[PDB]
Design an enzyme around this catalytic site. Sequence first.
Site, mmCIF file in Angstrom:
data_model
loop_
_atom_site.group_PDB
_atom_site.id
_atom_site.type_symbol
_atom_site.label_atom_id
_atom_site.label_comp_id
_atom_site.label_asym_id
_atom_site.label_seq_id
_atom_site.Cartn_x
_atom_site.Cartn_y
_atom_site.Cartn_z
ATOM 1 C CG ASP B 13 -40.128 -63.171 8.035
ATOM 2 O OD1 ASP B 13 -40.316 -63.122 6.785
ATOM 3 O OD2 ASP B 13 -39.002 -63.060 8.580
ATOM 4 C CE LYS B 16 -44.674 -58.475 5.367
ATOM 5 N NZ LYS B 16 -43.874 -59.030 6.464
ATOM 6 N N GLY B 40 -40.532 -62.310 0.944
ATOM 7 C CA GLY B 40 -40.947 -63.670 0.635
ATOM 8 C C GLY B 40 -42.296 -63.946 1.291
ATOM 9 C CG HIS B 41 -45.146 -61.790 1.108
ATOM 10 N ND1 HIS B 41 -44.567 -60.863 0.270
ATOM 11 C CD2 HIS B 41 -45.175 -61.223 2.335
ATOM 12 C CE1 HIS B 41 -44.266 -59.778 0.965
ATOM 13 N NE2 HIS B 41 -44.623 -59.968 2.220
ATOM 14 C CD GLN B 224 -38.662 -56.019 3.167
ATOM 15 O OE1 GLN B 224 -38.680 -54.967 2.536
ATOM 16 N NE2 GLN B 224 -38.878 -57.192 2.600
HETATM 17 O O1 LIG Z 1 -36.268 -58.875 3.708
HETATM 18 C C1 LIG Z 1 -35.673 -58.650 4.704
HETATM 19 N N1 LIG Z 1 -36.058 -59.006 5.972
HETATM 20 C C2 LIG Z 1 -35.047 -58.579 6.812
HETATM 21 O O2 LIG Z 1 -35.130 -58.773 8.034
HETATM 22 C C3 LIG Z 1 -33.995 -57.945 6.055
HETATM 23 N N2 LIG Z 1 -34.447 -58.016 4.765
HETATM 24 O O3 LIG Z 1 -33.602 -56.572 6.441
HETATM 25 C C4 LIG Z 1 -32.189 -56.434 6.635
HETATM 26 C C5 LIG Z 1 -31.538 -55.905 5.360
HETATM 27 O O4 LIG Z 1 -31.775 -56.776 4.267
HETATM 28 P P1 LIG Z 1 -32.071 -56.248 2.772
HETATM 29 O O5 LIG Z 1 -31.414 -54.991 2.484
HETATM 30 O O6 LIG Z 1 -31.585 -57.327 1.844
HETATM 31 O O7 LIG Z 1 -33.516 -56.108 2.600
HETATM 32 C C6 LIG Z 1 -31.748 -57.846 6.987
HETATM 33 O O8 LIG Z 1 -32.126 -58.166 8.330
HETATM 34 C C7 LIG Z 1 -32.625 -58.659 6.005
HETATM 35 O O9 LIG Z 1 -32.733 -60.009 6.469
HETATM 36 NA NA NA Z 2 -41.375 -63.445 4.858
#
Ligand SMILES: O=C1NC(=O)[C@@]2(N1)O[C@H](COP(=O)(O)O)[C@@H](O)[C@H]2O
Ligand code: NA
Lengths: 431, 431
Positions: B13, B16, B40-41, B224
């Site tokens: 977040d 990006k 999610g962008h 991420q």
């Molecule tokens: O897209 C993500 N952002 C995260 O911080 C996150 N996934 O990383 C960790 C594992 O999620 P996931 O396997 O669904 O990607 C969680 O903190 C989830 O919120």
């Molecule tokens: Na995001």
Amino acid sequence: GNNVVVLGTQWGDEGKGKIVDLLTERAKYVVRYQGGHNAGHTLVINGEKTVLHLIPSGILRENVTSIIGNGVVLSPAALMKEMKELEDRGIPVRERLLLSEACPLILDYHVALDNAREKARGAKAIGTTGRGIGPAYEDKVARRGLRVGDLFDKETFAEKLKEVMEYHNFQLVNYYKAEAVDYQKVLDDTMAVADILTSMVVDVSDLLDQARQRGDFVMFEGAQGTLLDIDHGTYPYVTSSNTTAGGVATGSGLGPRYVDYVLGILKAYSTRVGAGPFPTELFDETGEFLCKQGNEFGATTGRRRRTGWLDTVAVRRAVQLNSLSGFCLTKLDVLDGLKEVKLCVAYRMPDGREVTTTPLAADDWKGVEPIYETMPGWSESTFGVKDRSGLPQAALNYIKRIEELTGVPIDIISTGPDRTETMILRDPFDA
Amino acid sequence: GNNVVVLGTQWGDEGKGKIVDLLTERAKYVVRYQGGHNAGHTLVINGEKTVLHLIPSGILRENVTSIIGNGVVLSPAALMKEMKELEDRGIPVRERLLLSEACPLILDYHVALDNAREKARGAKAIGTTGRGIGPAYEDKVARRGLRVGDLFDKETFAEKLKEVMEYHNFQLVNYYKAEAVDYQKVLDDTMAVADILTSMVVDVSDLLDQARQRGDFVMFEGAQGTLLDIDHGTYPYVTSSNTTAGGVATGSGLGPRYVDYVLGILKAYSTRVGAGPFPTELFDETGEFLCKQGNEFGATTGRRRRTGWLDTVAVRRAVQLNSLSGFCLTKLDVLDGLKEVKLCVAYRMPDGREVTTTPLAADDWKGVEPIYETMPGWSESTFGVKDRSGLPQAALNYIKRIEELTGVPIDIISTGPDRTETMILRDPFDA
Ligand SMILES: O=C1NC(=O)[C@@]2(N1)O[C@H](COP(=O)(O)O)[C@@H](O)[C@H]2O
Ligand code: NA
Ligand SMILES: O=C1NC(=O)[C@@]2(N1)O[C@H](COP(=O)(O)O)[C@@H](O)[C@H]2O
Ligand code: NA
């Protein structure tokens, strides 16, 4: 440059170990970045033969620290066994090795799951080393696994170990109808080496970044080979880690902008251990000759390496996936005496289509037939030759053709199993 | 250079999407190399707000082909839903997108396993997006999973799907005591999009190597953030793919020697979604202010992002792991009006030890306390500022201090959610 990678361009067993041991003469560090003890690197220094698996191939050199990166799945059992053998030969392992507390751990239940899944795959079994590598990598990405770091807390290690084993034994007993693995045994076995491990721990990425600033020479030692890469390989007949150059950053923590040279080991002909497509496989006298001459027998049932002609279509693919900057031709001498030599330059698709790029998934390989280029072999011996000028024209032509097809120079040529039976045309640390 | 990477320096977040959409103006290709629709962008172009997940952020640009690399675990369901929304807005998705037949597939049973494992983790649940990402990555490294490629053969897809589901439903029903996933449903659902997928397939590594030879401009879009990297993150509170720069080679097939510039997105303050250590977390008015001002609410229960001061100890770690070459400061404006701003420059260990490097495993973080540097905030608005000279001294000082602590220049500054509310000090494609 400072950071030189050494990975196999084919399906493993290209001669990586030897080359690392050789070039580390100038390195401060040697780093393993993926795989486990499924790897087997034999060294022969002035007659003495050392076989390593988990420990990096720079271990027999003093003034060179060996590091096992976080990419490595680590069996404390295997590490032990391997430490004692060298410590016995007089090699001061405990003093030259360093680990990353981020390495997952391979424990009894992984080897068991590995054997169970393979027996269950039946006819479509992969040909796994049976050392629990895939299972270990599976617990890691599933975020359920233990890592060396977990050992800093004996008490917690116990709590976590129980949950994980609870889950795995349920799988075994109820699903694979197999013997359960004893929790207490594993807890005890592990706890007994916990202090050996934790004492060799180091923050590798920080270390590698420091060395980068001081200009130290780092040698990354890859295991297996490009076409067994969990991503770009002949899935599913593949190993569960990234064997390609990208795994260096991922498994060691070194930024990708810092890899200076990538040396691709290229065995003068092809081999494959385990199941999997091999378009260039030989089932004739030549096939027989290459194996007997190559001496690729294995450690046991099923490790007898398959053989075939060098595959340039597949090699060119290892070229792009790794941004190779040089090749190291090994075992050129296994070809000595053959009347004519051959190399695959294209694949004929079932539908008559002649392509120059390799398929991805193993199923996509099912019907390809190689299209070779035949050229004259050579009668004179190349075994042990240290000088290029001493190579027979036909041998030199074989080399040049590999360089024209791939577009990559052949910088080192190995002409024998000894560390000294090599020709260094261009040093990676000099480019 | 030609190949520019855009990854998050923190815990996701960072902003990006916006940055990719912005800079792709000059790219020929944009590439997703890891993760899935857990990403999610959100984009806001001249008021219009587009939210993407699986599709690369270069999609709203014509003359820019979007590629989903083999690193991406792919949900055909999510891909569909996402294609129709844009296709509806008038975006010709089917025409600008390309896939890699090497992407594993996320199917119903993965989301189910994901939810089951999380409910079973109980109090130690990770905070997963619930989209079946880890399960998909687990089938892949276990070599049991399906990949887009598997769809080329409808008949075989069926055979393979049955074995995999047999195994997973046994897990669910017998072990997680959960509802089984219907094989036939999944087979049907999938088979119905099989032809959409397979028609957008392309051999990405070959493509990327070609573009490299023509000098094309490639933009790799990471998902991420650095500290959620399955290897170098705060395991196990981490995502199951390599978010760090090494995943570019691994997940796209581009040799590592070809990454030219690595742009690290750096949000002006910290946030974290899901469980996991966060030494710099705020639970006061400021903590409240940053969230309300940041508007990091989530899509649902549990996606309300945690907030805290920018953590320079953790950022410096993202610096070395990625060989960053530039930062892009986003959301500087969320800090507007605050009396004084703060940034963590060291961690005080429980045992009084003040370190400057971050721990690895989440457990190793359990007792660290941040040691901040406090400096004056600024009253004037920075929202929407496009010119540097228009930034308040205190804001500029905040920037310079980040540059001194990390040693990396801040090349782009985002001053608003709009594509046009940005200051490009130095273009990555120009360096
Ligand atoms: O897209 C993500 N952002 C995260 O911080 C996150 N996934 O990383 C960790 C594992 O999620 P996931 O396997 O669904 O990607 C969680 O903190 C989830 O919120
Ligand atoms: Na995001
Ligand atoms: O070390 C290895 N070399 C291989 O070819 C091999 N492993 O890769 C495949 C998977 O084995 P494993 O998971 O044990 O590494 C098999 O072909 C196995 O023989
Ligand atoms: Na070997």
